[PDB]
Amino acid sequence: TEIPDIFLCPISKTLIKTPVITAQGKVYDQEALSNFLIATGNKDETGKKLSMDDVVVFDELYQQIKVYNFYRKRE
Ligand SMILES: [Cl-]
């Protein structure tokens, strides 16, 4: 019933809807990080600088989440 940790967003604390990855190699939900960077003014969870224009959509993980959604919504 639990959600796999690799699909969890550090911010929303739940399943990622569209995974983006930072140059540092960190993975967030696209919309969860967008609003969070607005609330803190381009600062991440650890207080370090981060802009939304510096992340890309992690494609392979996005594909993996879609597959997970199939097996989850099956139950
Ligand atoms: Cl992966």
Side-chain angles (χ1 to χ4, degrees), residues 1-60:
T1 302
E2 51 185 346
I3 299 183
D5 192 88
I6 55 178
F7 298 151
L8 290 177
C9 180
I11 301 176
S12 73
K13 295 294 184 58
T14 49
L15 184 65
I16 295 179
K17 309 188 190 309
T18 302
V20 285
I21 181 177
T22 64
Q24 191 183 34
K26 242 168 173 180
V27 173
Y28 306 97
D29 175 34
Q30 191 182 42
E31 289 301 321
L33 186 69
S34 295
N35 292 267
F36 184 84
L37 284 196
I38 295 303
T40 66
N42 297 342
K43 299 288 181 56
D44 68 337
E45 49 275 5
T46 57
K48 302 166 212 169
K49 350 300 166 179
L50 183 55
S51 184
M52 193 58 50
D53 305 334
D54 302 331
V55 308
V56 297
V57 177
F58 198 169
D59 285 320
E60 184 167 359

